[PDB]
């Protein structure tokens, strides 16, 4: 029963962690989009 409880809690935690990884990947994609917008602003400042 202890092993079953540990396995279930670990499985839930790792599923949450994988979902945390996918949301972190989405957040990094959003950060990369913000960085691309900042680079576009930097290029406009550089041309000015």
């Amino acid at each position: 029963v202890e092993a079953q409880d540990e396995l279930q809690q670990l499985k839930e935690d790792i599923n949450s962690r994988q979902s945390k990884i996918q949301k972190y990947k989405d957040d990094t994609i959003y950060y990369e989009d913000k960085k691309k917008v900042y680079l576009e602003n930097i290029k406009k400042i550089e041309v000015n």
Binding site: N41, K44, I45, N48
Partner: protein
Amino acid sequence: PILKRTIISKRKAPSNNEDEEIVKTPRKLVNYVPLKIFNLGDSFDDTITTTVAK
């Protein structure tokens, strides 16, 4: 007398020179547009006077 009141401007005569729009109009996040090629000055041309100095 009449001259002082005519020269002076009543604060009530205008609407305190109210601006357009309730809040300030929005602007672009960078919008630098440096320009400023000429700052005042201008008037008499520099090339002609430079030739005159030569």
